[PDB]
Amino acid sequence: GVQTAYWVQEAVQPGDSLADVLARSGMARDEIARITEKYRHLRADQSVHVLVGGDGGAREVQFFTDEDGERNLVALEKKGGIWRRSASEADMKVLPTLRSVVVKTSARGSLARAEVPVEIRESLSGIFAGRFSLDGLKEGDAVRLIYDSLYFHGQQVAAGDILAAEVVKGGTRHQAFYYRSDKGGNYYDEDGRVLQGFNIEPLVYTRISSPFGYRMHPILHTWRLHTGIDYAAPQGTPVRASADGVITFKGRKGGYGNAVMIRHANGVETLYAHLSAFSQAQGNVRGGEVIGFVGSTGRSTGPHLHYEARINGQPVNPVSVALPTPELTQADKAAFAAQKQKADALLARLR
Ligand code: NI
């Protein structure tokens, strides 16, 4: 009898194009065209979804883009015969995720079995990197986490930042709390003291135009993930290394324009882009010496620096990880205490 609509999932293979994946799914030739007419692009490690109507006609197509610098969540619907970027306020919903796990084999291993996003395992590693090694957790060691999770139409699509984390290694308790204020946040321990190389910011900037993490466009309601920090600064402004390490690259790089990377050791790297010019200071960099100057090369509006920290792999909120953490004043102390208590109430849920 009558046919019902169904979803088709097509994974994205190496250096694949949208039209490519869309074609392997079985989508019509002329249909692929009407789509790519308005929409180095397709984020690998995923799969584009296509809703097929009972009549075999495509009605929707959602997927993630991995453009250089940021990733976009593209949702497209077909109405009246035209593909339009679908979006709405109620589409996404962020919830606090309470995950508790006890180490058995390895720390990173057990956390993976507990359904803990790779992003979080690495973000957690850098946060406590100044107290212990996340890989030195023996059996019986606990890891209690609380982090925002993004749900698209009731379906978990990503993971926000860590709100609080309690780790017990060998019986020693280590706590980390996320604190935000003013008109990104930072991580502090239970006593409000700084946790933990990166003793300075990459430069002197006028203001931070765009923070790290997921954010919804105020009017388009679309969602995008900025894989770094946008430091607004006059072009030509000296861009120095945040810490020691060794520069491993430099030159034009996709939408990043001129950029350089530094392997700060311990399995961590950094990247500064959109530079107007370098300064050629390869080899080992003491940490602090100029390595570039602000510009607007690659995919960028005006002058500013793109700071991106990549722990054991890909993008990770550089805050309190690959940047210095400011001390808490009275303009905080009280507020922080109020926030620490809220997170601890959720933590106690995993004890
Ligand atoms: Ni950026």
CATH of the domain at 109: 3.10.450.350
CA distance 273 to 299: 10
Residue 275 Cα, ligand 1 centroid: separation in angstroms?
Answer: 12
Asked if 223 and 277 sit in the same domain, the reply is yes
Task: Report yes or no: 262 and 248 within 8 Å, Cβ to Cβ.
Answer: yes
Experimental method: X-ray
Q: Is 19 helix (H, G, I), strand (E, B) or coil?
A: helix
Q: Coil, strand, or helix at residue 111?
A: helix
313 HSE (CA, 13 A, CB side) = 8
Asked if 323 and 242 count as a contact pair (C-beta separation under 8 A), the reply is: yes
What residues contact residue 329 under an 8 Å CB cut-off, 6+ apart? none
CA 224 remoteness from chain centre: 10
- How many angstroms does the Cα of residue 344 sit away from the middle of ligand 1? 33
If asked whether residues 214 and 237 sit together in one domain, one would say yes
Domain end among 86, 113, 132: 86
306 and 218 in a common domain: yes
Q: How far is the CA of 256 from the centre of ligand 1 (A)?
A: 8
Residue 103 and residue 171: Cα distance in Å, rounded?
13
Pair (236, 313) in one structural domain: yes
Residue 60 CA to ligand 1 centre (angstroms): 29
CA of 68 to the centre of ligand 1 (A): 9
The maximal CA–CA distance of the chain, rounded, in angstroms, is: 72
Cα of 69 to ligand 1 centre, how many Å? 5
Q: Are residues 311 and 269 in the same domain?
A: yes
Q: 41 and 95 in one domain?
A: no
55 and 134 together in one domain: no
- Residue 333, φ and ψ in degrees, nearest 5: -10, -60
CATH number at residue 313: 2.70.70.10
Residue 299's CB is within 10 A of a number of other CB atoms, namely 16
Residue 344 annotated as binding?
Answer: no
CB 150 within 8 A of CB 159: yes
The answer to whether residues 112 and 60 touch, using CB atoms and an 8 Å cutoff, is no
Q: Which of 71, 86, 101 delimits the end of a domain?
A: 86
**CA pair distance 195, 325, nearest whole angstrom:** 8
Write down the residue that tokens 């097509």 correspond to. 10
Is residue 230 part of an annotated ligand binding site? Answer: yes
Residues 214 and 319 grouped into a single domain: yes
> Within this chain, do residues 224 and 267 fall inside the same structural domain, yes or no?
yes
d(CA 306, CA 313): 18
119, 181 in Cβ contact below 8 A? no
Burial pattern 237-273, b for ≥16 Cβ within 10 A else e, equals bebbbbbbbebeebeebebbbbbbbbbbeeebbbbbb
**Residues 114, 152 share a domain:** yes
Which structural domain, as residue segments, surrounds residue 96?
87-196+325-351
- Residue 218 CA, ligand 1 centroid: distance in Å: 18
How far does the centroid of ligand 1 lie from the alpha carbon of residue 301, in Å? 10
Contact 143, 103 (CB under 8 A): yes
User: How many other CB atoms are found less than 10 A from the CB of residue 32?
Assistant: 19
**Pairing mode, if any, of strands 207-210 and 229-232?**
antiparallel
d(CA 204, CA 18): 40
Handedness of CA 238, 239, 241, 242 (dihedral sign): positive
Residue 225: is it exposed, middle or buried by C-beta count within 10 angstroms (0-12/13-18/19+)? buried
Q: Single out the residue in 54, 86, 118 at which a domain terminates.
A: 86
CA of 104 to the centre of ligand 1 (A): 39
CA of 297 to the centre of ligand 1 (A): 12
The answer to whether residues 229 and 319 belong to one domain is yes
Q: How remote is the CA of residue 305 from the centroid of ligand 1, in Å?
A: 8
Can you read off the two tokens belonging to residue 32? 């692929």
For the chain, the domain total comes to: 3
Whose structure tokens read 């607007």? 296
Taking alpha carbons only, the member of 110, 98, 177 closest to residue 137 is 110
61 and 114 inside one domain: no
> Looking at this protein, which amino acid is placed at residue 136?
G
